[PDB]
Every structure is written in C-alpha cells, then in structure tokens.
Symmetry: C3
Subunit: 82 residues, 3 copies
C-alpha cells in the first residue's frame, strides 16, 4: 500500500479536511487559526481569506466551491464563496 503526505506546510494540530470536485484539498489548520487549500498537483498551499477565526475545527466544500468552516472558538459557522 501507498500513503502520500500532502505538501501542506507549517500545520499545527490540523482538524478537518474536505476535497472538492476538482480535487482541491481544504484543511482547517486549527492551531494556526486558518484554513489552507492545495489544488490537485500543486506544490504550494494558499491561505483562504477568512476573518477572525479561532480554533476552527471542521470544513466542508460544496459543488460550487463554497467553503464552510466550523469556527469553534467563536461558536459560529462561516462560509466563503469561491
């Protein structure tokens, strides 16, 4: 069997992963209060422009590429269009 480590960088206690129809992978980087994504084949993550996250701990992405995050430290759910 083969498992592959994805080239995210500087993750801290990550918690939550989603993958869209394009194979882009989204991760709630819980310990760094941010959400990062990696397109299929890409070597470098991008940080999603959410605002004021605290201990985010879950992520989902819909068919339109809208990203939903459980912003746990703030007791709320936020979403960001593609």
């Amino acid at each position: 069997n083969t498992q592959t480590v994805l080239p995210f960088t500087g993750l801290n206690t990550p918690n939550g992963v989603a993958v869209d129809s394009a194979g882009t992978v989204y991760v709630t980087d819980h310990g760094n209060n941010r959400v990062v994504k990696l397109a299929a084949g890409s070597n470098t993550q991008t940080v999603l422009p959410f605002t004021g996250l605290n201990t985010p701990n879950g992520v989902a992405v819909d068919s339109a590429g809208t990203v939903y995050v459980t912003d746990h430290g703030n007791n709320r759910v936020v979403k960001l269009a593609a």
Copy 2:
C-alpha cells in the same frame, strides 16, 4: 470576497459540518449535544431527531440526503434518512 456567518441559533461549540447537493448545511454541536441543519436561503435551523448522543462530532450526508454522525462518547456511528 468576504465571509458570511450562517444564522444558526444558540450554537455552542460546533464540532463538524457537512453540506448536501442542495446546499443544506449540517452542523454537530457539543454544548447542546445535537445536530442541526439549515436550508440554503433559510435563517431558521431545524434540530435533527437523533437521540441518546454523547457529543456528536463528525457529520456527513450522502446523495440521498441520509445524515451520518459520529457519536463520540458512545463509540458509534448513527444515521437518519432524509
């Protein structure tokens, strides 16, 4: 491109999120020990009739709208049909 906050009422320590093909958003809630959902365009959530949960954590939804939840404290996975 600015984030929006979803109108869940009384959310306390969300643990996970999923979104179906219709854009309905499902969230697991630690403090209230329950799972809630919000249709796209709605600002009144519904509480899903799971019972005997001890901290729902993960949530997923399939193409048939069946909702799956990891019941963390009871070491089990429960589902409800649409």
Copy 3:
C-alpha cells in the same frame, strides 16, 4: 423518526465521518489511531492501510475513492488511493 446504529465495531472516540458514492462509510477511529470503513451490504468493517497515524481527526473521500485524513498528532494530511 428512527435512527440506525451502523455495525461498526471496536470504535473508540470516533470523531470524523465521510460517505462515498457506493454508500461506503469512513470513520476516523481517533482513540485507536486508525481509519475504518464499512462496505454496504456485507457490513465488512475493514481498517484502511494507513500507517503511523496519531490521533487522526478528519476524513474526506473524493469522487475517485481516494481517502484523505488529517493526521492531527503528526501535523500532517495523508491520502490513500482506492
């Protein structure tokens, strides 16, 4: 409103769940440092051949059957092809 408890066995503090097209359900069995899946029909529980996981806490599955896990304890995200 009847909920169904799936025939997973031996879970410990499960905290992430995903479901694929074949109706296969994947769970991050966090307390056992593993990811399990349940095949529809036969209800054969199989442990996915990830290795070196530590307190995993998020799982996702793409349209190709590739499984993605946030390996929280190791600050990384790992994937496994079908």
